[PDB]
Design a binder for this molecule. Sequence first.
Ligand SMILES: Clc1cnc2c(Nc3ccc(N4CCOCC4)cc3)nc(-c3cccnc3)cn12
Length: 246
Amino acid sequence: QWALEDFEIGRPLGKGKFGNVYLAREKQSKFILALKVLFGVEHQLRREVEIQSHLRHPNILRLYGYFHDATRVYLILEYAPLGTVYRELQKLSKFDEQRTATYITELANALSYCHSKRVIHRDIKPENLLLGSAGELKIANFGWSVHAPTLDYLPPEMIEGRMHDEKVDLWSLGVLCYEFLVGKPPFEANTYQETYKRISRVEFTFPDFVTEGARDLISRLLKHNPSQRPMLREVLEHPWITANSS
Ligand SMILES: Clc1cnc2c(Nc3ccc(N4CCOCC4)cc3)nc(-c3cccnc3)cn12
């Protein structure tokens, strides 16, 4: 289908791994979008392209198509006007309960959908969250996404090799909810090995300003045993959530 001859490239939106992500417009349609430029994860990419392209959800970043050349490979992606949640977090330090509960909801819904098609992200972090025109949360980057059943956002069962299910994303959902309210991940350490131990033992504490309601939800999501964690349905139906979401 597409090719570079079809696009007028704009400013860089951000830097990534294999390459940058540029703003771009499709000459013929004048349609605005983002174009990911990438020069042995090639396999996890065929799954990224495969997985995401078929995924269609308001709170998930859309992949319109792809194309490559003798040098790099381009991913034609939906453009997110308000950038990453990561940046909004560095800019605001922390989020209020209203904002956090909303992201959690939008995120839960997108994950609920994801799990129906039997897909798990396993890489849910602020850097992989974007914001639409209305400031709605949109999940991107499925490079580490699998279809079957930094450490900061990985559950105990993953860092320890064990087989995992759709439960991983609820652990990540807890870690995320905590970072939105506090400004830093629950298990943040200065080294890989320390973080590992803290995630293994599930060692986390709350700043005083973290309300009892929020502590509950987070404490429910961060259980070492996947079986104990709530399911997305229960998450939406959390008192602290419904009292702050929208
Ligand atoms: Cl994929 C994809 C689709 N849309 C985006 C997007 N959008 C975006 C819009 C606006 C602003 N602002 C920055 C200053 O304030 C004014 C505008 C930043 C990013 N960013 C990234 C990204 C961000 C960071 C690192 N690596 C990639 C990836 N994206």
